[PDB]
């Protein structure tokens, strides 16, 4: 039989391993020849594997690269102008790769050029609350200072925005061992820890969903009219550069001024973690000088788009997408994901060669330039937005398959919760001690839901990956799954070798998943989801799961507002409309679910009508006007946090209107905007509910 | 049989007449008790007629009314402050209505309050080009002057915007006999001409599609958070008041200053039509004083929404909508339309009682507050936008059935051209001399297409009626039809008694359509369109008709740009991408049409897929970012003219970027914006084309 079991059984750990090796021998930086060659290889193989069509979709987007003959570095300079200490020009390459060409040195993509010189201020993680502590409690002014911040906790782009708004004239990002060196584990190549010379690459844009900085709203095609650089979206205004902890220790060790305000500001290096500004007495006339010469250049990128046409509903699309471009070798990010997508395509193709087709069309994507701001996925979605919003059933992301080896991680829309629970009950656990038990059982034991006994944790989608356009701009049901580390010891900074040269095939094969069993499990989850979405007669979405979370989110936002009882009285701030909308949603969803299981099974129009109601439910949460000053974040329930792009925020319009409201000079205006956002949210919830009512 | 002929044959002239009489005995001003009572009557009758459900949908919107105890008027004052001439407080009521209560006196809805006093400047029709002539050629400065403008040629709201931007401190609008007195015809009640005491009411907003000024984007429901009056959309900043030509003659007769620049500035009164400013020597110390005391007030309005549920595709909506509110009796506007809708509902209901149902759901609407800015239709569409954009097949408007008695007028989307041609070939002409001939034949003879022999004129949709939200915001295929006057003698100002107290049942029955045969013909056109849209197995849209007009519009916009050949060279302004998109659209549409007639007839999914492609084609022309500074005009092909809301403009983004471009101080910036709009238009055309490609 051609059923899900046939699909899942065809997936092989050994194939995933072979593909990962194949994808990680040379760098595949976006916009480079080697990443174009890999695109062409993937296109050719997907055709061989049996897809109906496989095309490249190219765009010309703004990218950023160091200058090969004018390297980026940071100095400590003395009062004479002599550079007495210089940061490294490159990470020491790992064993057997010391002759590999075209390893991009560490840099912060999209940094402007400059050679600012000044006194350091240490700003912890450069979070909003870190800057509050500096400016409001400690009275330290970052204006005209070079800030040094440790990576971790939030997306690095947010750190840069925060530093820029504090008046910094440059930013130095570094990896502290407190956040990137797990105790008792050896540095690469002898274990999975970050060495002192290791450096995390990564873009520092604040795009808010825009895609290519020069073409917001429209694809960067061959006739596109581009913004000038001065009107581009999301570019930082001050130079930024990342360093390792050997070099950071040399910058931090001389710091003077105020002591750290408490132990949450101290990392693990043998330095005091003084805030500054500037150095202690003997070194007070020394300064820090950045030298950044990177350039921004419009560069061609290539997405591979494979189609497996549906037998019954070819105008309904289920999308499995993940990126191909990497900072260097991409051993985990993204090729551990891409290898999984490759094996999923191979398996689906094996069924297709035997005469099977899915009910709905499946689209497979290998995205480019994800590392430079989700550019390839977003430009393609901009080009195809009309097709996607009328025909898009679901988007399953497929970046890194592993960030640890402890248990499963799933982030998705509530519409997929039931699907994920049911699928994981039918999959085998790969975990030690759970032989013969389901993945649902091991996952639930290791990552219990904070709210329901006997259920696993599923998180909100944040951002920082290629699902963003699909979910928060277009309102297509989206999800992601991978293996992760223990949620208890999880400090929200990722794996130590993230975006480092040390992220290699050997890292994965030696230290993460030698048998490729966690990769296989992730392939079964991502592939099983795509299979069920593309083949189930009734779309596998449960609207009642949205009703439950909406009440939880309404309770949460009300509880934030209720810290200001006087103001709620003065300005007559009521959440009654939102709770009423949520109650209505709950009632209407329950009645829709009854019809979905009571409806005449033999009637395909009632079926297609009900499937369209399910499909367009996520879509109903889109507000075409967007969120305030973030026109491409249109989902009213979920947006990336304004303080941390990686984190999802619920009722973001209301949350941002309430945030730090006690510091606003015009409380009448501020609370008026809270009330406006309550109205928008209540209306949107009710409108969404009404899409599930009887249609006439 | 229950076919279209059964539906059309059930329609009766005598019923339309009875309904028109019933709807026009008392005023039905939006927000008044009498218009609520008529809503309830219509609801009750639509239920009796056989609709499945009939509900009122209410909203609380900003309306505007005169002050009953502090009347609006204009004076000529002398240097002592004595008011030596006053304009009328009311129109002399027509015979037999001199005791009717609650006739709203003439006023300009949404005028602010004020008592400005100054010198008059006569500005012709207050069009953009009239103000160019004054300011650029004649060097007359309107700053701080009261402007007097004749009604006609463009929407009065545009006149007010133009006067405000010229620095006027008030506007007086009047009806010149040149524009509202047809030679050889008697004044009401002895014919259909405007008497000297007659006055045209009407709003002077510039909403650009926003709906209720206080709640742009969201319905004005019971928990709506409203803008303050200072941030409301579209309100005029200077007082405005309308007068008749007896009173205008008294204001114009003393005008001095410059002579009119040519005969196109002279109306038909026995005055010189001097531009001013101010009066001739003997009267130079006299001034004009306005006294406006109208108030803006949030007021409840009521739409009636009737549903006839579809038998096969109940989740597909065909909407027949027209307004109910009137300025006074509404003898033509809107009740000649509403009477037709009422008879259409009755006919459909007669078929329903015999066991028939349409294939798709039909929605019938009686909109409120159309006269105050399309408020009722727009708030309802805002509430139901998610349902409408996923399920809306088409919108047929049904305001005034007659503006003359010469021939048919149709304005619609190109998608409906074929439908209209085919339907009118099957309907009888009601015209004298065409007994036994088709309506298509009489219409084609009297109103020939300017472009194709043997075809009739069909215009672009402009705005100024309730289709605006459906078409230019939401992208639902829309159309309108009525009887009109001769296109040759048509001076684009409407019928003389427009928005006057004299617009009565007797006007219609005595002078326009004594046998109600033109009303019956319009009922057959509007109803026949709704019938075909709601019942045809394949939606009756021909995408190839869009391809033809797109080429015509591309040719037109290119020819505007080519008046500036040097600048096109300097700034490398190419229309190649737009022409390429149009060519592609043409090719893809032709191939889609072949599939639509070659497709497996027995396959309902291929049918529903192809019907969805047809339905969503209009939708594909929507840009979610809107047009520049007009976020609710989202259709890229068609928007209301920035100079005249009544007129449709093609490729409006490009047109407005080119308009008066030679006067822009930064030509590089101006031509850059032309190129940006070309890119947007070419992309949108191509994207629309791609929705008609094979889906996978
Ligand atoms: C969750 O779902 C429920 C439905 O179960 C919605 O309930 C509606 O709530 C609104 C707001 O409370 C109600 O609004 C009231 O409508 C009254 C008239 O209702 C009749 O007529 C209308 C059409 O005109 C019909 O739709 C309806 O079925 C009734 O037959 C008005 O008279 C009320 O206004 C008066 O009171 C208010 C408040 O004191 C004053 O401000 C006004 O000035 C005026 O005096 C009021 O507008 C509506 O009737 C309810 N519909 C029902 C029960 O079907 C919830 O709104 C929904 N939640 C959300 C967030 O949408
Ligand atoms: C109307 O419909 C036609 C299709 O019939 C569209 O034609 C496309 O037009 C674009 C723009 O001219 C073509 O773009 C070119 O693509 C080349 C590569 O194409 C191959 O590979 C791609 C995927 O990467 C496939 O999609 C394609 O089938 C081909 O196999 C590029 O190499 C070209 O770039 C080079 O030349 C340009 C111009 O000199 C330079 O600026 C570049 O730097 C570079 O040197 C170019 O990008 C595209 O191939 C055409 N598709 C076809 C024929 O299928 C029209 O675009 C469409 N009109 C509109 C308005 O959309
Ligand atoms: C995940 O798995 C659960 C458990 O199997 C699925 O829920 C079950 O769905 C079936 C099929 O719709 C339900 O069966 C129905 O039972 C009613 C009587 O109660 C009957 O009238 C119908 O004809 C039908 O047989 C079953 O009740 C339901 N079980 C539950 C909720 O416990 C669930 O749908 C799956 N989720 C997906 C596919 O997303
Ligand atoms: C308006 O009326 C015209 C004329 O009747 C309609 O066009 C006609 O549509 C029919 C039905 O699709 C076409 O018939 C087809 O002919 C081809 C062979 O040429 C055959 O393969 C198909 O099976 C089918 O019989 C007919 O050609 C076509 N005539 C034309 C274009 O002259 C038109 O569709 C109507 N418009 C609407 C409903 O909007
Ligand atoms: C720190 O580096 C500076 C600059 O050196 C250049 O850039 C480096 C990153 C690397 O590419 C070097 O090979 C380049 O010379 C050194 O300062 C320079 O020293 C040279 C030789 O003494 C002198 O002629 C230059 O003028 C200096 N340039 C500047 C800008 O000061 C410096 O010696 C290095 N410091 C240490 C401690 O190694
Ligand atoms: C023009 O009207 C003014 C104002 O009259 C008032 O408003 C009118 C529209 C109407 O409602 C009148 O009944 C009101 O009295 C006249 O000027 C007033 O004249 C009265 C009586 O002589 C005097 O006491 C008031 O102070 C005047 N008010 C003002 C504002 O000047 C004026 O006489 C009328 N002119 C003509 C030619 O009829
Ligand atoms: C990755 O795998 C691909 C596919 O097997 C290899 O590319 C093939 O290489 C052979 C031998 O050079 C050629 O004859 C084929 O044409 C290639 N097939 C393609 C591109 O589809 C590639 O060499 C492998 N890369 C590494 C680093 O092992
Ligand atoms: C317009 O027609 C309606 C419907 O026939 C009339 O309203 C009815 O009036 C009778 C007699 O007063 C009542 O018994 C009915 O209840 C009414 N029916 C309704 C409201 O559905 C109304 O009188 C007519 N108006 C005019 C001006 O003739
Ligand atoms: C890179 O730096 C070199 C030499 O220091 C300079 O000549 C060149 O212009 C720079 N390249 C770019 C792309 O800016
Ligand atoms: C920070 O520093 C600059 C002066 O260099 C000043 O303009 C700014 O206002 C200071 N801010 C505070 C809060 O002291
Ligand atoms: C892989 O799993 C083992 C078993 O607990 C663990 O000791 C090892 O550290 C894990 N690897 C990573 C990279 O976490
Ligand atoms: C209308 O005018 C009267 C008397 O001239 C005044 O008392 C009243 O306030 C005004 N009404 C409104 C609604 O402004
Ligand atoms: C028109 O009048 C005012 C002075 O009352 C002046 O400010 C304005 O610039 C004048 N405009 C022109 C074009 O003369
Ligand atoms: C109605 O038609 C007749 C016939 O041409 C014409 O004389 C009369 O003026 C028409 N009525 C109107 C209002 O145009
Ligand atoms: Ca773009
Ligand atoms: Ca509104
Ligand atoms: Cl992922
Ligand atoms: Cl109309
Ligand atoms: Zn990645
Ligand atoms: Zn990454
Ligand atoms: Zn009207
Ligand atoms: Zn009107």
Question: Are B251 and B172 in contact, with CB atoms under 8 Å apart?
Answer: yes
Question: Are B176 and B169 in contact, with CB atoms under 8 Å apart?
Answer: no
The alpha helices in A236-374, defined as continuous H runs, are: 245-252, 335-353
Question: What is the 3-class SS of B217-262, one letter each residue?
Answer: CCCCCCCCCCCCHHHCCCCCCCCEEEECHHHHHHHHCCECEECCCC
Sorted by sequence, the CB contacts under 8 Å of residue B32 that are 6+ apart come out as B102
- The tokens for B330 are 């509404």
Per the DSSP assignment, residues forming a β-bridge with A349 are none
The helix-helix angle for A13-23 and A335-353 (nearest 10°) equals: 130
Q: Is A531 left (phi over 0), alpha (psi -120 to 50) or beta?
A: alpha
Closest CA relative to residue B264, chosen from B368, B150, B118: B150
- The tokens for B210 are 């926003």
Per DSSP, B168 falls in state -
The vertex-A390 CA angle with A389 and A396, nearest 5°, equals 55
- The answer, yes or no, to whether any atom of ligand 7 lies below 6 A from the CB of A378, is no
Choose the residue to mutate in A143, A145, A163, A169 for probing ligand 10, maximizing ligand atoms within 8 Å of C-beta. Answer: A143
Across the interface, do B695 and A361 touch by the CB < 8 Å criterion?
yes
Question: Are A13 and A520 in contact, with CB atoms under 8 Å apart?
Answer: yes
| Residue with token string 């009164």 | B269
Kind of pairing, strands B360-367 and B313-323?
parallel
Closest CA relative to residue A16, chosen from A522, A386, A658: A522
Closest CA relative to residue A622, chosen from A478, A407, A416, A441: A478
Under 8 Å CB pairs connecting chains A and B tally to 116
Q: How far apart are CA A476 and CA A685, in angstroms?
A: 16
Question: Are A426 and A521 in contact, with CB atoms under 8 Å apart?
Answer: no
The vertex-B262 CA angle with B257 and B263, nearest 5°, equals 115
What sign has the CA pseudo-torsion A421, A423, A428, A430? negative
- The tokens for A111 are 């940094």
Question: Are A645 and A633 in contact, with CB atoms under 8 Å apart?
Answer: no
B303, containing H or E segment:
strand B295-308
Q: Where are the domains of chain A?
A: 1-66+293-540, 67-292, 541-696
Closest CA relative to residue B619, chosen from A387, A470, A475: A387
- The answer, yes or no, to whether any atom of ligand 1 lies below 6 A from the CB of A584, is yes
Per the DSSP assignment, residues forming a β-bridge with A74 are A290
- Catalytic positions of B are 370, 574, 612, 635
| Strands of B117-118's sheet in order across | B83-86, B73-77, B287-291, B117-118
Per the DSSP assignment, residues forming a β-bridge with A75 are A86, A289
Strands (DSSP E) found in A343-454: 360-367, 392-397, 407-412
Q: What is the CA radius of gyration of chain A?
A: 25
B333 assigned ligand-binding residue = yes
The 3-state DSSP class for residue B588 equals helix
Question: Are B308 and B301 in contact, with CB atoms under 8 Å apart?
Answer: no
A381, containing H or E segment:
helix A375-383
Sorted by sequence, the CB contacts under 8 Å of residue A209 that are 6+ apart come out as A378, A463, A468, A469, A472, A473, A630, A632, A633
- The tokens for A443 are 């996952």
Kind of pairing, strands A83-86 and B392-397?
unpaired
Question: Are A240 and A160 in contact, with CB atoms under 8 Å apart?
Answer: yes
B454 assigned ligand-binding residue = no
The 3-state DSSP class for residue A114 equals strand
Q: How far apart are CA A627 and CA A635, in angstroms?
A: 8
Alpha-carbon dihedral A516, A518, A522, A527, rounded to 10 degrees: 40
Closest CA relative to residue B169, chosen from B292, B76, B252: B292
List the single residue in A with minimal CA-CA distance to B693.
A387
Q: How far apart are CA B193 and CA B139, in angstroms?
A: 37
Closest CA relative to residue A614, chosen from A563, A524, A696, A546: A546
The 3-state DSSP class for residue B472 equals helix
Query: Would you tell me how many other CB atoms lie within 10 Å of the CB of residue A620?
Result: 22
Per DSSP, A95 falls in state T
Whether the upstream peptide bond of residue A334 has omega within 30° of 0, thus cis, is yes
Q: How was this structure determined?
A: X-ray
Q: How far apart are CA B199 and CA B242, in angstroms?
A: 7
Q: How far apart are CA A182 and CA B22, in angstroms?
A: 84
Kind of pairing, strands B117-118 and A170-174?
unpaired
Q: Give the residue whose CA is nearest to atom 2 of ligand 9.
A: A70
Whole-number Cα distances in Å, B525 to B49, B130, B347: 21, 38, 14
| Residue with token string 């219509």 | B42
Sorted by sequence, the CB contacts under 8 Å of residue B244 that are 6+ apart come out as B88, B91, B174, B175, B194, B195, B196, B197, B198, B199
Across the interface, do A619 and B687 touch by the CB < 8 Å criterion?
no
Buried b (16+ CB within 10 A) or exposed e, A259-274: ebbeeebebebebebb
Strands (DSSP E) found in A332-391: 360-367
- The tokens for B156 are 């009065």
Strands (DSSP E) found in B506-601: none
Q: How far is CA A615 from the centre of its chain?
A: 23
Closest CA relative to residue B300, chosen from B30, B27, B111: B30
Active site residue A64: no
Closest CA relative to residue A177, chosen from A168, A186, A167: A186
Phi, psi values for residue A77, rounded to 5° = -110, 145
Phi, psi values for residue B252, rounded to 5° = -85, -30
Closest CA relative to residue B686, chosen from A222, A645, A511, A462: A222
Q: How far apart are CA B418 and CA B541, in angstroms?
A: 7
B171, containing H or E segment:
strand B170-174
Q: How far apart are CA A179 and CA A190, in angstroms?
A: 19
Q: How far apart are CA B377 and CA B361, in angstroms?
A: 18
List the single residue in B with minimal CA-CA distance to A609.
B315
Q: How far apart are CA B250 and CA A641, in angstroms?
A: 65
First to last CA, chain B: 40
Closest CA relative to residue A58, chosen from A452, A379, A451: A379
**Alpha carbons within 13 A on the beta-carbon side of B83:** 10
Cβ-Cβ contacts under 8 Å, B675 against chain A: 225
Kind of pairing, strands B360-367 and B295-308?
antiparallel
Sorted by sequence, the CB contacts under 8 Å of residue B74 that are 6+ apart come out as B86, B87, B172, B241, B243, B247, B251, B288, B289, B290, B291
Query: Would you tell me how many other CB atoms lie within 10 Å of the CB of residue B37?
Result: 12
Q: How far apart are CA A162 and CA A168, in angstroms?
A: 9
**Alpha carbons within 13 A on the beta-carbon side of B405:** 19
- The tokens for A112 are 């402007």
Q: Give the residue whose CA is nearest to atom 33 of ligand 2.
A: A222
Closest CA relative to residue B19, chosen from B52, B46, B56, B50: B46
Kind of pairing, strands A287-291 and A313-323?
unpaired
Question: Are B326 and B21 in contact, with CB atoms under 8 Å apart?
Answer: no
Class of domain B67-292: alpha beta
The helix-helix angle for B576-598 and B667-690 (nearest 10°) equals: 10
Closest CA relative to residue B388, chosen from B478, B485, B465, B454: B478
- The tokens for A320 are 């499995």
Question: Are B466 and B367 in contact, with CB atoms under 8 Å apart?
Answer: yes
The 3-state DSSP class for residue A241 equals strand
Across the interface, do A672 and B604 touch by the CB < 8 Å criterion?
no
Phi, psi values for residue B46, rounded to 5° = -60, -35
DSSP labels, B40-96: HHHHHHHHHHT-SEEEEEEEEEEEEE--TTS--EEEEE-TTS-EEEE--SSPPPPTT
Per the DSSP assignment, residues forming a β-bridge with B484 are B407
Q: How far apart are CA B517 and CA B435, in angstroms?
A: 12
Cβ-Cβ contacts under 8 Å, B578 against chain A: none
Q: How far apart are CA B60 and CA A94, in angstroms?
A: 69
**Alpha carbons within 13 A on the beta-carbon side of A97:** 20
Query: Would you tell me how many other CB atoms lie within 10 Å of the CB of residue B298?
Result: 17
| Residue with token string 């999209």 | A110
Question: Are B417 and B543 in contact, with CB atoms under 8 Å apart?
Answer: no
Closest CA relative to residue A312, chosen from A242, A382, A361, A362: A361
Alpha-carbon dihedral B201, B206, B207, B212, rounded to 10 degrees: -40
Q: How far apart are CA A671 and CA A575, in angstroms?
A: 13
Q: How far apart are CA A519 and CA A522, in angstroms?
A: 5
CA A20 to chain B, closest CA, distance in angstroms equals: 30
| Residue with token string 């046998």 | B515
Closest CA relative to residue A671, chosen from A596, A561, A588: A561
Q: How far apart are CA A56 and CA A37, in angstroms?
A: 12
Class of domain A541-696: mainly alpha
Kind of pairing, strands B313-323 and B392-397?
parallel
The helix-helix angle for B604-619 and B576-598 (nearest 10°) equals: 150
Whole-number Cα distances in Å, A223 to A215, A305, A391, B583: 11, 21, 27, 16
Closest CA relative to residue B237, chosen from B164, B149, B317, B293: B164
**Alpha carbons within 13 A on the beta-carbon side of B442:** 25
Q: How far apart are CA B62 and CA B494, in angstroms?
A: 27
What does chain B come to in residues? 696
CATH for B1-66+293-540? 3.40.630.10
The 3-state DSSP class for residue A360 equals strand
| Residue with token string 């033999």 | A602
Query: Would you tell me how many other CB atoms lie within 10 Å of the CB of residue B636?
Result: 27
Closest CA relative to residue A148, chosen from A85, A89, A74, A213: A74
Q: How far apart are CA B539 and CA B394, in angstroms?
A: 10
The 3-state DSSP class for residue B117 equals strand
Deposited resolution, Å: 1.6
DSSP labels, A611-673: HHHHHHHHHTTB-TT-BTTBTT--BSSEEEETTEEEEEEESHHHHHHHTTGGG-S-HHHHHHH
Sorted by sequence, the CB contacts under 8 Å of residue A459 that are 6+ apart come out as A409, A410, A411, A648
| Residue with token string 């392939």 | A523
Q: How far apart are CA A232 and CA B413, in angstroms?
A: 37
Sorted by sequence, the CB contacts under 8 Å of residue B27 that are 6+ apart come out as B34, B100, B102, B103, B104, B326, B327, B328, B329, B330
Closest CA relative to residue B147, chosen from B162, B128, B132, B129: B162
Q: How far apart are CA A671 and CA A570, in angstroms?
A: 10
- The answer, yes or no, to whether any atom of ligand 6 lies below 6 A from the CB of B78, is no
Q: How far apart are CA A342 and CA B265, in angstroms?
A: 74
DSSP labels, B340-397: HHHHHHHHHHHHHHTT---SEEEEEEEES-GGGTSHHHHHHHHHTHHHHHHHEEEEEE
Query: Would you tell me how many other CB atoms lie within 10 Å of the CB of residue A101?
Result: 7
**Alpha carbons within 13 A on the beta-carbon side of B70:** 11
Mutate to test the interface with A, among B225, B615, B626, B670 (most CBs of A within 10 A): B225
A22 CA → ligand 3 middle, Å = 43
The 3-state DSSP class for residue A544 equals helix
Q: How far apart are CA B685 and CA A477, in angstroms?
A: 28
What does chain A come to in residues? 696
């Amino acid at each position: 039989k051609h059923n899900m079991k046939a699909f899942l059984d065809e997936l092989k750990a050994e194939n995933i391993k072979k593909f990962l090796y194949n994808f990680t021998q040379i760098p595949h930086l976006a916009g480079t020849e080697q990443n174009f060659q890999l695109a062409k290889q993937i296109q050719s193989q997907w055709k061989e594997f049996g897809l109906d069509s496989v095309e490249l979709a190219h765009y010309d987007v703004l990218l950023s690269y160091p200058n090969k003959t004018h390297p980026n570095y940071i100095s400590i300079i003395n009062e004479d102008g002599n550079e007495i200490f210089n940061t490294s020009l490159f990470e020491p390459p790992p064993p057997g790769y010391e002759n590999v060409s075209d390893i991009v040195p560490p840099f912060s993509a999209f940094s402007p050029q400059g050679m600012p010189e000044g006194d350091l201020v240490y700003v912890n993680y450069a979070r909003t609350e870190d800057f509050f502590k500096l400016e409001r409690d400690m009275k330290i002014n970052c204006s005209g200072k070079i800030v040094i911040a440790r990576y971790g906790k939030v997306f690095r782009g947010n750190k840069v925005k925060n530093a820029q708004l504090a008046g910094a004239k440059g930013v130095i990002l570094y990896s502290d061992p407190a956040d990137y060196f797990a105790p008792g584990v050896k540095s690469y190549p002898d274990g999975w820890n970050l060495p002192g010379g290791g450096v995390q690459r990564g873009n520092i844009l604040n795009l808010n969903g825009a895609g290519d900085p020069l073409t917001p709203g429209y694809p960067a095609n061959e006739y596109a009219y581009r913004r000038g650089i001065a009107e581009a979206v999301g570019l930082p205004s001050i130079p930024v550069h990342p360093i390792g902890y050997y070099d950071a220790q040399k910058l931090l060790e001389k710091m003077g001024g105020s002591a750290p305000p408490d132990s949450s500001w101290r990392g693990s290096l043998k330095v005091p973690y003084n805030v500054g500004p500037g150095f202690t007495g003997n070194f007070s006339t020394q300064k820090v000088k950045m030298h950044i010469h990177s350039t921004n250049e419009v560069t061609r990128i290539y997405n591979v788009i494979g189609t497996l046409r549906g037998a019954v509903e070819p105008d309904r699309y289920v999308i499995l997408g993940g990126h191909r471009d990497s900072w260097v070798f991409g051993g985990i990010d993204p090729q551990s994901g891409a290898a999984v997508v490759h094996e999923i395509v191979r398996s689906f193709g094996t069924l297709k060669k035997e005469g099977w087709r899915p009910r709905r069309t499946i689209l497979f994507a290998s995205w480019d330039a994800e590392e430079f701001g989700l550019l390839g996925s977003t430009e393609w979605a901009e080009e195809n937005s009309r097709l996607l919003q009328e025909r898009g059933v679901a988007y399953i992301n497929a970046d890194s398959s592993i960030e640890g080896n402890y248990t499963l991680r799933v982030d998705c829309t509530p519409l997929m919760y039931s699907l994920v629970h049911n699928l994981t009950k039918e999959l085998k656990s790969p975990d030690e001690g759970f032989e013969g038990k389901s993945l649902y059982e091991s996952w639930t034991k290791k990552s219990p839901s904070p709210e329901f006994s006997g259920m696993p944790r599923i998180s909100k989608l944040g951002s920082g990956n290629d699902f963003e356009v699909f979910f928060q701009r277009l309102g297509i049901a989206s999800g992601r799954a991978r293996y992760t580390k223990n949620w208890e010891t999880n400090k929200f900074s990722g794996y130590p070798l993230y975006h480092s040269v040390y992220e290699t095939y050997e890292l994965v094969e030696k230290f993460y998943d030698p048998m490729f069993k966690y990769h296989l499990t992730v392939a079964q989850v991502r592939g099983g989801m795509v299979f069920e979405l593309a083949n189930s007669i009734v779309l596998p979405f449960d609207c009642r799961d949205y009703a439950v979370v909406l009440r939880k989110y309404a309770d949460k936002i009300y509880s934030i507002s209720m810290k200001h009882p006087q103001e709620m009285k003065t300005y007559s701030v009521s959440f009654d409309s939102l709770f009423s909308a949520v109650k209505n949603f709950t009632e209407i969803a329950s009645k829709f679910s009854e019809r979905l299981q009571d409806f005449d099974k033999s009637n395909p129009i009632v079926l297609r009508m009900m499937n369209d109601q399910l499909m367009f439910l996520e879509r109903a949460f889109i507000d075409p006007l967007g969120l305030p000053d973030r026109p491409f974040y249109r989902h009213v329930i979920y947006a990336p946090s304004s303080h941390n792009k990686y984190a999802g925020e619920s009722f973001p319009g209301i949350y941002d209107a309430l945030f730090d409201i006690e510091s606003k000079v015009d409380p009448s205006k501020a609370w008026g905007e809270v009330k406006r956002q309550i109205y928008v949210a209540a209306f949107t919830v009710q409108a969404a509910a009404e899409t599930l009512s009887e249609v006439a």
